[model samples]
Target: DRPKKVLILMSDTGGGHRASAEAIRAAFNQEFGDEYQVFITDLIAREIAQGLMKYQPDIIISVHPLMQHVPLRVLRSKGLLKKIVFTTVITDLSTCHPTWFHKLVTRCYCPSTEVAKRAQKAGLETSQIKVYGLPVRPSFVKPVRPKVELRRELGMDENLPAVLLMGGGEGMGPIEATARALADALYDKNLGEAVGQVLIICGRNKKLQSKLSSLDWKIPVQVKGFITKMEECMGACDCIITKAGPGTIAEAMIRGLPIILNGYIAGQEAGNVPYVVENGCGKFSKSPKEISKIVADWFGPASKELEIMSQNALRLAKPEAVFKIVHDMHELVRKK
Candidate 1:
């Protein structure tokens, strides 16, 4: 009999979803080998998920401020109300029906179930959404060397604490201002001697890279146009400063490194802010000043808090996501 093939769908709207999908794909490949053929797609740009890309930016800016407090709100707010609302209205929809939303909520937030429902109505079977939990890298389960060692491997400094900054894969928002904010925070008199080395990943944004490169910083800084070894970078750093892109956040969580987020794009990233903060994993930064303080604090003596946060993050990883989806594919093909 021919091997079964599985189609893994994802998108590049932000780096996290695609990264999560890729992690699942890799996991499937490792476990099943030649038993299954897996194909991954960017649902956002290619098919039904495409519509989400259109409204991502406006949504992100609108809710970025709100994300700062969302995690706390969600924790304190009643889940029963969400259940009531989801049951009454969202449940009737194809995308957010209790079954579907429950599955999605385990691994990632279902930003706009309407889009998902539309895809389902167009013939994509709901059963296809099989996997659960974000497929973060396995290395996050283990510890790596300090930032200096990581920087040394990357051809940078070895003595200074390093800061990892990213704006998702498409290089979405807050490029120049965030960079300057990071620089200002380092120079701020309040930070005292706590400032460390800074590294920024531009993620294919040439304009952002050019702008950052031309500017002068008081501390050593390295700007990457695009890096393939992000897992390594995350492993090396003591702290991470980035948007609420799911993949990057997942990686940070797995590594147990504290993070500073600027917030999420409204509809999709809306769930991200609370998820990170509620776990005691990270903080929200609406301003560069806030971002700097959070970064300093995470790396400061109080940083021990991340030890628990890191453990909490590990609990969220879905080591079985890829396998579960692949196994389901085999069963699906067998039934056919």
Candidate 2:
């Protein structure tokens, strides 16, 4: 028999969906070896229909809310495609939108118990909802490099605390202002030895990167635009300052890096701020100055907050989730 085909539906509009899809794909490849073939795409409208027809997938997995209806529509079409196993892996935390859950999906993998509960209330059967934590790339799941060694490689002070600032994939948010505030705070003599180097990742935002690169920073600062090696960066940081993007938060958790959420997109990412704070992994502060202060306190002398938060983050991380989801998918395919 030929290798089983799996279709992974994802969109590039946001990084999380694609990252989730990639994680599942990697897990399937690692676990099942040559027995399965995985295909990933973000096609929409007519292209989505065409792609489905061409792939004729045995299992369909969706990672984005926008693409959820595509698989349902395919299932509704007549013939052998109706028997395909359909799954959705919710990438958002806490309050996921109702559209993410549908009765037609064979399985729903929720990032948290809260998300699963919300899906259940949305009329999905209890059996259909599985609380598998968000799927993250294999890099995030791997054991982190030694801090001292990794910091040296990144051109950072091995002894000093490290702060990672990110603006998601599009580099959306007030990153320039936040970086300035944190830089100034780090150089303040009042903090003394508590100060640390700052690493800024301006994802694909050239304008913002140029502006930040031109600034005269007080502390040691490193700025880059859209680099692929985020796992290494997280491994070298003691804490992260970023917008409330689900992918970044999940990756940070896996790395045991505490968070200081500087901003978030309204409506969609609103719940993530609270989810971080309430879970004891991080805090939310829109003010750049306030965020800098929080970072200072966490890294200050005699501060146990950072250690506590790091422990909380590690406790919450589910590095094996992607593998479990892939295994479940394999079982579903076997049954069919």
Candidate 3:
């Protein structure tokens, strides 16, 4: 009758990996009020195997594609495989690594149906897969105030369209170029006047942020550095221009922001481009010029395109997925 136990094998492969583990742990805490409380440790199976018996957990969740197989295989060898539950909470959106489809996993939680199908094709039984969408941080699922009120609270003009632009952690790629293009398209009215503004969150890129903020005579451009409150930012904006970081894409859908996937790191996420587009919630373009034109049309005077995509985003986001996954986890824990 000790406290319920959980093991999170999240190797710090990248920011998203750790983030997925953290948010899932949050779901557990949010659901049970820590009664069957569990905590997290960022580690691999080699080190994980060390405390197998001393800290044998009721649930072992692998948040990284690379972390899942090793830890589960280690558990199998330790003769505790069935005694403890093992599951993979896959992090990628449209695609997953071949490593995530282990046959012995109690289940696989996918962020999208495409990934669920991939899991099945890669050898996981259909019954072993659940499309619960991504596990969003609890902050995102909270009921948002009406968008107009939210905009007013953020000191933004509720009448005009506000397009949010963010470069990823480094504020990488042509952050300034896209801003200039988007602004020019809207202000020039070449794609038709939008009467829109741009808000830039260039994380860790002080130079770009400084330059963007210093610029004058643009379409109500406001520039800032990293933000801790993206929920507020998303709530306040009409649409978003960002690199195809899946985490943000998922969050944007929850806030119902039409997305312009500015760019993606090639090869690794080639499939993510189409995932947003095919779903009707977002778009992408190689030329910043074209990207701006598309956005201008969407936000153009009396335009309904932007509003339509916003609806698509809202429909696509599985706001209930985090709770669903928590419910699934609790059921799994009890059954095991």
Candidate 4:
């Protein structure tokens, strides 16, 4: 069994690029075990491809958008272009930059049909594109433990509906107001009986976290400053109220948490709103009152709507995305 080498290229331009490479590497280790050895490096666009003849890792993966052209031209010049498989694994879910499309690229693993469309418009043939998904941490795709198991682990309710509230890492937009509104919407009417814990993750917003923490919540509430265990927190909760970020959306779907998209940036994230809403796994709202009203209906007495949403999100979950990527690339590396 010859141990094939893998060289993944990226730069620190965006942290997500490097992290995605590591996730793919982890997926490889789990699937191929010791049969493959993966190595990661940066600034190959700043190339030293003069060394490519020495390493000869038949597969060179580009996870960063800025990294496509320069090194590929170098390999082509050395006459090694036909011998190596060069793939670009796009990290962005939508809004493909023009730089991401390269005629020399062997293939592109796209995260969505919209991005696949972007690739096609930029001139990659259908043969060079695979519509997959953003590879989340393996933890996200693993079989979720029972909610009761998780709820208790978080010291939360055993049966009462648990909902999570947070924006992206900065806790941006009306999160504090949304948490307060959700509590009042469900509890203000005095025993209409649709109350659940509201979990807030103020991922680097110390001021917001303290503000949320100081407020007296009528419903059971948990507040925190940062979280590394989103898989755990999302598992403990019945649904999510967060911004329309692709990473969060992908993770929530994988965990089967129905989403409530509060807001989105105009360009890259605007498409995802319809992507989730049209598919029936989530909804979009611009205000805290409106957001809470929807949450109340979903998690209120019957909980049937929430149940249906949970089911749909799971049905749409791409749990095998990472493995599918690994398996597909393995074919390229293993072939003559």
TM-score to native of every candidate shown: 0.65, 0.92, 0.89, 0.84
Could you tell which candidate, 2 or 4, scores higher by lDDT?
2
By TM-score, highest first, what's the ranking?
A: 2, 3, 4, 1
Kindly report which residue stretches of model 1 are placed more than 4 angstroms away from their true locations once superposed. Answer: 10-16, 42-132, 137-147, 168-173, 187-194, 306-311, 315-336
Q: Give the candidate number with the greatest TM-score.
A: 2
Per-residue CA lDDT of model 4 for 126-197, tens digit only, reads: 889998787777866666678889877777777777788885453235887788888887674655664677
Residue 33 error for model 2, in Å?
2.4
Better of 1 and 3 by lDDT: 3
lDDT tens string, model 2, 210-265? 88888887887878789677888899889998877788888899888899887776
Worst 10 residues of 3 by lDDT: 11-20
Task: List where candidate 4 sits over 4 angstroms from the true fold.
Answer: 11-19, 40-44, 47-57, 77-80, 168-171, 192-194, 265-268, 301-305
What TM-score would you give candidate 2 relative to the actual structure? 0.92
**Between candidates 2 and 3, the TM-score winner:** 2
Model 3 scores a C-alpha lDDT of 0.77
Computed on alpha carbons, the lDDT of every model, listed in order, comes to 0.52, 0.81, 0.77, 0.78
- Candidate 1, poorest ten consecutive residues by summed lDDT: 84-93
Model 4 vs. true fold: TM? 0.84
Better of 2 and 4 by TM-score: 2
lDDT of 3 at 158: 76
Q: What's the CA error at residue 60 for candidate 1, in Å?
A: 30
Best by lDDT: 2
